[PDB]
Design a protein around this motif. Structure first.
Motif, PDB file in Angstrom:
ATOM      1  N   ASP A  87       0.816  -1.215   0.000  1.00 43.55           N
ATOM      2  CA  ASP A  87       0.000   0.000   0.000  1.00 43.55           C
ATOM      3  C   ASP A  87       0.845   1.258   0.000  1.00 43.55           C
ATOM      4  O   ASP A  87       0.548   2.222  -0.723  1.00 43.55           O
ATOM      5  CB  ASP A  87      -0.959   0.033   1.191  1.00 43.55           C
ATOM      6  N   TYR A  88       1.921   1.236   0.778  1.00 43.42           N
ATOM      7  CA  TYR A  88       2.794   2.394   0.875  1.00 43.42           C
ATOM      8  C   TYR A  88       4.129   2.290   0.147  1.00 43.42           C
ATOM      9  O   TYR A  88       4.687   3.314  -0.250  1.00 43.42           O
ATOM     10  CB  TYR A  88       2.984   2.780   2.346  1.00 43.42           C
TER      11      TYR A  88
ATOM     12  N   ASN B  46      -3.101  -4.422   3.889  1.00 41.47           N
ATOM     13  CA  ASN B  46      -2.897  -3.672   2.646  1.00 41.47           C
ATOM     14  C   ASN B  46      -4.140  -3.702   1.773  1.00 41.47           C
ATOM     15  O   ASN B  46      -4.112  -4.202   0.649  1.00 41.47           O
ATOM     16  CB  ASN B  46      -1.715  -4.260   1.876  1.00 41.47           C
ATOM     17  N   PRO B  47      -5.230  -3.092   2.252  1.00 42.08           N
ATOM     18  CA  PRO B  47      -6.487  -3.068   1.497  1.00 42.08           C
ATOM     19  C   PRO B  47      -6.455  -2.368   0.130  1.00 42.08           C
ATOM     20  O   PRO B  47      -7.119  -2.804  -0.806  1.00 42.08           O
ATOM     21  CB  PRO B  47      -7.449  -2.381   2.469  1.00 42.08           C
ATOM     22  N   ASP B  48      -5.677  -1.299   0.004  1.00 43.83           N
ATOM     23  CA  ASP B  48      -5.634  -0.569  -1.264  1.00 43.83           C
ATOM     24  C   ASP B  48      -5.095  -1.406  -2.418  1.00 43.83           C
ATOM     25  O   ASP B  48      -5.671  -1.424  -3.504  1.00 43.83           O
ATOM     26  CB  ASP B  48      -4.782   0.704  -1.146  1.00 43.83           C
ATOM     27  N   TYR B  49      -3.991  -2.101  -2.173  1.00 44.29           N
ATOM     28  CA  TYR B  49      -3.347  -2.911  -3.198  1.00 44.29           C
ATOM     29  C   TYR B  49      -3.950  -4.311  -3.351  1.00 44.29           C
ATOM     30  O   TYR B  49      -4.150  -4.787  -4.474  1.00 44.29           O
ATOM     31  CB  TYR B  49      -1.852  -3.029  -2.891  1.00 44.29           C
TER      32      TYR B  49
ATOM     33  N   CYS C  97      -0.402 -10.324  -0.683  1.00 41.26           N
ATOM     34  CA  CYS C  97      -1.841 -10.495  -0.777  1.00 41.26           C
ATOM     35  C   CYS C  97      -2.372 -11.919  -0.673  1.00 41.26           C
ATOM     36  O   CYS C  97      -3.571 -12.111  -0.460  1.00 41.26           O
ATOM     37  CB  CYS C  97      -2.371  -9.803  -2.031  1.00 41.26           C
TER      38      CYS C  97
END
Lengths: 16, 16
Positions: free
Chosen positions: A14-15, B12-15, B3
């Protein structure tokens, strides 16, 4: 930093 | 990859 450390980078897309 | 693992995925929800 996290993204400059390989293992932390690998676990934080994510980051990094 | 991150993931494919539940813990990393949730961190890491965004990715993922």
């Amino acid at each position: 930093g996290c993204c400059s450390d390989p293992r932390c980078n690998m676990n934080n897309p994510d980051y990094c």
